[PDB]
Amino acid sequence: MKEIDELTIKEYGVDSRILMERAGISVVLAMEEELGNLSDYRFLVLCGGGNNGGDGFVVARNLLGVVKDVLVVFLGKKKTPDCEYNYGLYKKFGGKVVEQFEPSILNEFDVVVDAIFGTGLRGEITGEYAEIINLVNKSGKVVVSVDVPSGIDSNTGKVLRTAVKADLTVTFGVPKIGHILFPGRDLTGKLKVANIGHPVHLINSINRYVITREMVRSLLPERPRDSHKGTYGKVLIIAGSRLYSGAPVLSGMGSLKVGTGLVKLAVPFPQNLIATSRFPELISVPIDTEKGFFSLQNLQECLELSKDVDVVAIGPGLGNNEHVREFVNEFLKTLEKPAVIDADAINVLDTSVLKERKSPAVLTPHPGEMARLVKKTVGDVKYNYELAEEFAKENDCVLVLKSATTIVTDGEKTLFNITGNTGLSKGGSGDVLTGMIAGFIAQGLSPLEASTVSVYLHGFAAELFEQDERGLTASELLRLIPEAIRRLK
Amino acid sequence: MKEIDELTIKEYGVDSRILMERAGISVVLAMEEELGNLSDYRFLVLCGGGNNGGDGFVVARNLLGVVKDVLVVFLGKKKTPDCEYNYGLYKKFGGKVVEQFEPSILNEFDVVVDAIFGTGLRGEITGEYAEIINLVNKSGKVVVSVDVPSGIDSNTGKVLRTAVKADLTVTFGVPKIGHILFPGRDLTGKLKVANIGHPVHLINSINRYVITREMVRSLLPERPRDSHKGTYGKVLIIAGSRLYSGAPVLSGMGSLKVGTGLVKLAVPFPQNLIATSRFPELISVPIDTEKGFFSLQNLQECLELSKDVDVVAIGPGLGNNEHVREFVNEFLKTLEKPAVIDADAINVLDTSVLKERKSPAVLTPHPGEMARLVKKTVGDVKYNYELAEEFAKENDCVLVLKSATTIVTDGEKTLFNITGNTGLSKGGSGDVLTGMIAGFIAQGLSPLEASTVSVYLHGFAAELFEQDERGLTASELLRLIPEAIRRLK
Amino acid sequence: MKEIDELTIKEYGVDSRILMERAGISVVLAMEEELGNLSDYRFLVLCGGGNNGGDGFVVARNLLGVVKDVLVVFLGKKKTPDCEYNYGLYKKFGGKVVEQFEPSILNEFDVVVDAIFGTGLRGEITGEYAEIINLVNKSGKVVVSVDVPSGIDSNTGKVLRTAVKADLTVTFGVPKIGHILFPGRDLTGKLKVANIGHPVHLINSINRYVITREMVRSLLPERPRDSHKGTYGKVLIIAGSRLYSGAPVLSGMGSLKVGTGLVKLAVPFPQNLIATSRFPELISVPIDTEKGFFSLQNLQECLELSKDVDVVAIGPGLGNNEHVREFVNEFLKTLEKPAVIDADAINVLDTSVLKERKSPAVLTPHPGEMARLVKKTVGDVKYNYELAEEFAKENDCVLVLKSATTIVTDGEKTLFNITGNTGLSKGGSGDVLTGMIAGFIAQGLSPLEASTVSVYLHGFAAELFEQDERGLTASELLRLIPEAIRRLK
Ligand SMILES: CC(C)(COP(=O)(O)OP(=O)(O)OC[C@H]1O[C@@H](n2cnc3c(N)ncnc32)[C@H](O)[C@@H]1OP(=O)(O)O)[C@@H](O)C(=O)NCCC(=O)NCCS
Ligand SMILES: CC(C)(COP(=O)(O)OP(=O)(O)OC[C@H]1O[C@@H](n2cnc3c(N)ncnc32)[C@H](O)[C@@H]1OP(=O)(O)O)[C@@H](O)C(=O)NCCC(=O)NCCS
Ligand SMILES: CC(C)(COP(=O)(O)OP(=O)(O)OC[C@H]1O[C@@H](n2cnc3c(N)ncnc32)[C@H](O)[C@@H]1OP(=O)(O)O)[C@@H](O)C(=O)NCCC(=O)NCCS
Ligand SMILES: CC(C)(COP(=O)(O)OP(=O)(O)OC[C@H]1O[C@@H](n2cnc3c(N)ncnc32)[C@H](O)[C@@H]1OP(=O)(O)O)[C@@H](O)C(=O)NCCC(=O)NCCS
Ligand SMILES: CC(C)(COP(=O)(O)OP(=O)(O)OC[C@H]1O[C@@H](n2cnc3c(N)ncnc32)[C@H](O)[C@@H]1OP(=O)(O)O)[C@@H](O)C(=O)NCCC(=O)NCCS
Ligand SMILES: CC(C)(COP(=O)(O)OP(=O)(O)OC[C@H]1O[C@@H](n2cnc3c(N)ncnc32)[C@H](O)[C@@H]1OP(=O)(O)O)[C@@H](O)C(=O)NCCC(=O)NCCS
Ligand SMILES: [K+]
Ligand SMILES: [K+]
Ligand SMILES: [K+]
């Protein structure tokens, strides 16, 4: 968007002052939408010397004569030209500016407008900026942040030593990565994205996206009336072990609940019988194993089972030992079908295999699994969308990096999912999503499309749970999938 | 509270007469709140010679001129000074006092105010006091008890030969143990605790507590949005046998339904497969046993399974034989994790093991199990909160002594739970609570906090069952846990 | 009530401290009833050195530990014993007292409790008490007055140089005259009268009363089913002139709307025809006059018309000239029926006539008319209930002194009416009330009873008007009378 503002001024010829005026009035309107009538409130506007501060002076000026009181505290040592222009207007209109933040000043105001730093912040916040931000956060006032809460790195969502906790953030043109990834997402509060007059073509030239309800609705496959089960695809799920007998069942029902026609599971005997006792609509093939885990002796049978399906999911509950590792890698190297690779299949995966496959794959790691896959620390991979993009491009796959905000990428397009809640931070949730992705691929969506629709619907289903989210289990999530689909439509 | 009244008079300087006036007016207001307008009712006030009787004279005097009729029957042979003072006022205001209870007098009155004995009662009630109390209980009149129903031992809740059955009890400052433990709890009817002017500091210096909704709400852990399953803890449940295959499943789901991230069960094969057939989100590890019960040969495996969890629960459905006893005690002596110890693990427990553990423990006996643990009779341990406190202090543990009123103590603080109903008097209920406690410990609550929140939520869930409580089963209780959490919030 | 408190302590033996405690707790409960939960508010308690201040210390002490903050500002130079006692308790309980009112202290509090002066105030408030009261009134805080707003003379309702404007006033035992007469009535805000333990016999020995709905309901006459018009009385109204043709009509309908059986008007021809054109149920007898006003030539006819009625009303719209004066006085001296004397009949009345009548009379002056009748200024008679009582006793009549608060007295019992609104400050309103009084006398109520019921119902009817009260007219008031009667029942 730094690019976007510059082209809009330099190539399109929109005066920088017009963009700044539109930015500020949009904050005023946003506030009115959340607070109702503004005339009873007293506003403290905290302005930096940059263009975020300039936007703050526009806000402040537009409140003059209309609200109970407005004061600007200017916290800068110099002003960008647009900030200087809007400072001068604020003062010409009769506005009061002070240059020293006295901690008790907070007592006399209802709303704090945070226009200290925007996307221009670089480096840790120190000194008196930090003391001020901390005082605002302890004040209990309503906080409205201009563009991004001050102290959030707009490219990453990390806190730069400290940051404002906003009730309402008003950003311009498009959301920033820092609104979408945590901790930034938490500090943003309610986000409104304001149209401030950039050409719609430039706004739409962005290559990273938030997954929206309208996007998912347009990707949901068609259900032709004259269909039969094969119309809706066939999935094989290779999953489970004597240790982990539940995973197959959750993956399988995840495929069925999204509309897949036929789902079969290959599960070590007698753990395969667990699935049909719970959901007799599943096909749960018994696999004769030596000690309760898949091994190379099961390679040929699993390849034969794969011949008559559209997609294969592998990994949930397989276990991780050397014999599973041999099986997984040899299977994936030979399988000429799309694969969804999760859990223990990721843990044992040789990435060389991904490079040599002709068929597509989707990988669904959490950050612990991603860290192991690229031999890095969890902190180095968590919310690292550039790493994810590089990995997907280098390995010719779709990568679905699960977290509260889920990143989906094929290395060219990257999508961020914000549906869900903490009830999904519980064993079994990932197994459901794996089945969902395979099911949608089986119905004819591309690996990327299937991943996009699935992460959104999985999170939206969680949110439809009727009692406290901490009590949500994967079994209940399964029941909520068709409701999420209905509500989406 | 004997202490509380004395310090309030002697150190704070509040006249004893002021406290007694406040006590009596609080009974009047309480009655109005339950009966509506008092002017249509005829009141029979039964006064002893102590301060409870004095409170009764205040009630009676305050009804004069405002209700249809008031009569006091004075049943004492002498009067405390405050009782004498309020007797004289009652008579000066025109009140009628008789000194002989004629059984037919009950016919002419609507409400009986029981001010015979309060917390001053010592020893069995005999003679004419007993005949009177029995006549009141056969009368079918509305009964309001001042402080405690006469005949209840306020320290224990036991009936002292006979006691008044009250519709409404109005007590002063704080509830008494006798309101909270049975049979006293039953005889109290609806309880109101009136503020009669003790300093809030003295009221708050009490070391025993009733577990309230506000206490539990403040202890419920946080659900940070940017979480993953490990944020919410990991539990291992060592449970079950060839005899008792259901217990593990109920304990495990009890952990999951309270928001725990990961739950694994160690259960003798093939009984472990029962769990995942019902709830495939559980991990149910098969343990190779000789004859269907844990023994020392499973010690090393269970220790290895414990390395990657936060808390271990042990006991439900283990069975009780010598080989289980060897396993339990050796496991607990070696385990360096918090333990929740229930059921058959309590039955075989060597308490020496508790003393030598560095890690904490919570024990969850019913009175039969407690009796066996301390080698006493059920009657000697039931509702024996002092024994429970001594046991917890001596063994460095939290003790959760289950009954209709549940006692939770670490030997310094003692909490009483009054949520629940008789649907919990059924097999499986305790197994659920064990999982709940372990789950909350795994989420970061202290053993005492986890026990407090769990007993309350377990009982409150029971009360949310929509049909007759006698039909409640543990499976339905599990379903109701997240609703109890929602309602609590 | 000074008497009442003293007898309750000295004869009945209630400790003065008990009465003061009950007074203060009643203010707390009253506040809770109006503000809801008190725990979120910060209270500033302003205490004088008298017993009102003592009551304030009780309030303050009872808020300690339960609300957000409590501060007492003590504004006195010495303390009554009970005030000293409750000051010491407040401090022992940890309460903060300051002895200097800093104007900015108001900023830190939500509720001001006014316990500066009660019924003990004598003389104009000067100096720093006045500055404080004025600051409280400019503060916009919620104000609760203990007993009476400080600065109101509790015997008269006059402001003693300045006074507190309360949102809520809590008084003890009975309302004071100062709550009922203006300006005091305005400054009182919402009034609650608290029972603080005086014997009901002493509370009921008061000889002045507020007219209540229950009193009026018990006085409303019976409507036996087997009745006929004569059962419900007959009224003659002597009223009107060529100047004032509407008055008769309003008086007449006032009698009919309260249930009178027969109403006839004697009105100068042709103004008599106005009445039946509007309400043909009236009998409107034409009286042949010389120049449009009653005179002595009409004396005999009016006496004949009076023979067959129960009550005669005279005065509305008669005009005031010498010939009307001759007629009125000679008529009233000869008439041996109860008379209701209003308006121009009062203006020309010789009070010697009242003394010599054997039959009763009710007089209904406004303060201008009363002033003329006793040859005093309006300021000397307005709300002067002692003058009214003396006048009624000396002249053997009921006096109904109309104003926003209406005084009704026969010289032994005095009643205050507080129903009504400013829509009654408009021509025609008084003419309606005159008809109402005559009607009720005709139905068998005593002059005093009829006056009591009428003033209440007249005011209550005004309040039932559905649109803005300033638009109420006498015609609409007439329509609302039967609704007031229904609502009363
Ligand atoms: C203009 C833009 C290209 C980036 O620069 P900018 O907007 O001026 O940047 P900000 O207002 O966020 O902040 C810049 C100021 O932050 C402060 N700053 C940055 N890092 C800091 C640090 N860690 N410690 C202290 N101060 C720091 C400085 O005051 C800095 O200027 P300075 O370093 O010369 O002192 C653009 O991305 C932008 O923020 N505008 C958004 C669009 C908009 O607001 N709409 C229209 C108006 S142009
Ligand atoms: C399943 C089992 C292996 C536990 O593993 P797990 O918790 O699922 O471990 P994972 O590979 O899935 O990785 C979890 C890690 O990924 C990372 N992680 C996952 N999601 C994350 C996110 N959103 N953000 C940050 N970190 C995240 C964290 O580091 C997490 O560690 P933590 O749980 O300690 O916080 C184990 O309980 C079991 O089922 N079997 C026990 C068998 C055994 O090993 N011993 C006995 C022999 S039979
Ligand atoms: C005062 C207090 C310290 C304890 O003593 P108390 O209140 O006078 O005691 P009670 O009114 O319950 O009863 C005392 C009387 O009970 C009766 N009594 C006790 N046991 C009895 C027995 N089993 N058989 C017959 N009578 C018995 C007696 O009449 C006894 O006095 P007595 O033994 O000398 O004859 C205090 O705990 C209390 O009960 N007051 C509660 C607080 C209160 O009421 N608010 C303010 C007023 S002080
Ligand atoms: C489970 C089994 C052992 C029955 O035991 P149980 O009822 O659960 O016995 P517990 O140890 O739990 O103790 C129950 C006692 O505790 C006490 N108790 C529990 N809660 C109490 C409370 N709230 N208040 C008072 N007493 C209480 C009572 O004494 C109760 O006895 P009661 O049921 O007779 O009234 C048995 O049915 C079984 O499952 N297996 C049978 C195996 C066998 O022994 N024989 C065949 C060989 S295979
Ligand atoms: C006690 C009672 C007989 C009258 O006296 P009182 O209550 O102490 O009087 P108040 O509190 O209203 O005020 C007395 C004080 O007002 C102040 N005062 C009166 N007129 C004043 C004036 N115009 N200028 C300054 N101060 C004045 C004084 O401080 C005076 O005492 P002081 O003249 O010796 O300095 C009684 O009518 C009363 O007010 N109590 C009501 C009942 C009650 O409160 N319930 C129970 C408690 S007793
Ligand atoms: C009716 C007419 C005489 C006006 O008189 P009125 O306002 O009704 O005068 P009243 O006798 O009723 O007395 C009103 C006074 O009583 C007092 N008053 C009434 N109620 C009061 C109360 N509640 N509190 C205080 N004062 C009150 C006031 O002093 C009031 O005076 P104000 O209206 O100036 O404030 C006149 O308009 C008229 O109808 N005819 C005009 C004839 C004339 O005189 N001249 C032409 C010759 S034909
Ligand atoms: K900002
Ligand atoms: K009692
Ligand atoms: K006052």
Side-chain angles (χ1 to χ4, degrees), chain C residues 52 114-118 144-151:
Chain C
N52 200 241
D114 162 38
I116 303 166
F117 310 125
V144 180
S145 287
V146 180
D147 210 8
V148 298
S150 299

Side-chain angles (χ1 to χ4, degrees), chain C residues 229-288:
Chain C
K229 62 170 171 185
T231 311
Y232 299 119
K234 303 182 191 192
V235 164
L236 171 68
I237 299 181
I238 298 170
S241 66
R242 77 193 274 263
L243 293 184
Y244 301 114
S245 51
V249 188
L250 292 172
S251 293
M253 293 306 313
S255 305
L256 289 178
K257 292 293 202 168
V258 299
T260 311
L262 188 54
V263 180
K264 52 181 190 192
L265 314 177
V267 179
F269 178 85
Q271 287 73 37
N272 68 296
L273 295 175
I274 290 333
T276 50
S277 73
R278 185 61 215 270
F279 293 116
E281 45 273 83
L282 291 169
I283 296 166
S284 195
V285 171
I287 301 293
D288 176 8

Side-chain angles (χ1 to χ4, degrees), chain B residues 2 16 45 79 97 119 121 125 134 239 292 315 336-338 366 381 386 397-398 418 421 428 439 459 466 480:
Chain B
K2 182 200 205 300
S16 62
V45 184
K79 294 177 181 86
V97 179
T119 66
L121 183 53
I125 296 177
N134 291 334
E336 293 175 10
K337 292 301 178 173
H366 62 64
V381 311
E386 289 182 345
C397 67
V398 173
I418 64 173
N421 62 33
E466 311 83 344
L480 291 159

Side-chain angles (χ1 to χ4, degrees), chain A residues 245 383 422 426 467 470 475, chain B residues 221 223 226 256 276 281 486:
Chain A
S245 51
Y383 293 133
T422 72
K426 195 185 292 197
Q467 299 311 330
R470 80 189 73 194
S475 285
Chain B
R223 305 284 295 185
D226 188 27
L256 289 178
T276 50
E281 45 273 83
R486 178 174 72 81

Side-chain angles (χ1 to χ4, degrees), chain A residues 2 5 50-52 55 78 117-124 147:
Chain A
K2 182 200 205 300
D5 281 343
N51 296 142
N52 200 241
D55 294 339
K78 72 208 182 35
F117 310 125
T119 66
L121 183 53
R122 308 265 180 281
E124 302 284 290
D147 210 8

Side-chain angles (χ1 to χ4, degrees), chain A residues 331-410:
Chain A
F331 180 75
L332 290 172
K333 156 174 136 102
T334 306
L335 179 69
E336 293 175 10
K337 292 301 178 173
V340 181
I341 305 173
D342 185 27
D344 283 321
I346 298 171
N347 293 334
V348 306
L349 182 62
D350 176 354
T351 58
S352 306
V353 168
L354 292 176
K355 297 175 178 56
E356 68 180 293
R357 285 175 44 82
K358 289 16 161 77
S359 285
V362 173
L363 279 71
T364 67
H366 62 64
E369 287 161 344
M370 182 68 185
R372 284 193 294 259
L373 192 61
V374 301
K375 299 180 188 295
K376 292 169 193 287
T377 73
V378 167
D380 294 328
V381 311
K382 194 168 182 186
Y383 293 133
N384 190 340
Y385 51 94
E386 289 182 345
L387 187 51
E389 291 161 351
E390 284 183 299
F391 182 95
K393 185 196 170 199
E394 285 172 351
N395 290 282
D396 298 326
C397 67
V398 173
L399 191 62
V400 173
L401 177 65
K402 295 184 303 197
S403 279
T405 296
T406 290
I407 296 168
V408 179
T409 185
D410 66 4

Side-chain angles (χ1 to χ4, degrees), chain A residues 182 185-186 242 244-246 250 274 277-278 382-383 404 422 425-427 466-468 470-471 473-475, chain B residues 221 223-229 232 256-261 273 276-278 280-281 286 482-483 485-486 489:
Chain A
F182 290 89
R185 185 169 156 211
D186 249 349
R242 77 193 274 263
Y244 301 114
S245 51
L250 292 172
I274 290 333
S277 73
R278 185 61 215 270
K382 194 168 182 186
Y383 293 133
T422 72
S425 293
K426 195 185 292 197
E466 311 83 344
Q467 299 311 330
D468 190 277
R470 80 189 73 194
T473 59
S475 285
Chain B
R223 305 284 295 185
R225 292 209 275 159
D226 188 27
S227 51
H228 62 278
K229 62 170 171 185
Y232 299 119
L256 289 178
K257 292 293 202 168
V258 299
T260 311
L273 295 175
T276 50
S277 73
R278 185 61 215 270
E281 45 273 83
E483 185 185 348
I485 295 169
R486 178 174 72 81
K489 270 174 134 274

Side-chain angles (χ1 to χ4, degrees), chain B residues 8 11-15 17-18 21-22 25 29 61-62 64-66 85-86 88-89 92-94 195-200, chain C residues 8 11-15 17-18 21-22 25 29 61-62 64-66 85-86 88-89 92-94 195-200:
Chain B
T8 298
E11 301 281 349
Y12 289 82
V14 179
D15 196 285
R17 287 178 289 179
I18 297 168
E21 187 75 14
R22 297 263 313 251
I25 68 177
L29 286 162
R61 190 195 87 234
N62 278 293
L64 290 173
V66 161
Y85 179 67
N86 285 116
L89 290 183
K92 284 266 173 209
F93 274 57
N195 159 27
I196 67 168
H198 304 109
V200 175
Chain C
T8 298
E11 301 281 349
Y12 289 82
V14 179
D15 196 285
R17 287 178 289 179
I18 297 168
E21 187 75 14
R22 297 263 313 251
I25 68 177
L29 286 162
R61 190 195 87 234
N62 278 293
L64 290 173
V66 161
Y85 179 67
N86 285 116
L89 290 183
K92 284 267 173 209
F93 274 57
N195 159 27
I196 67 168
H198 304 109
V200 175

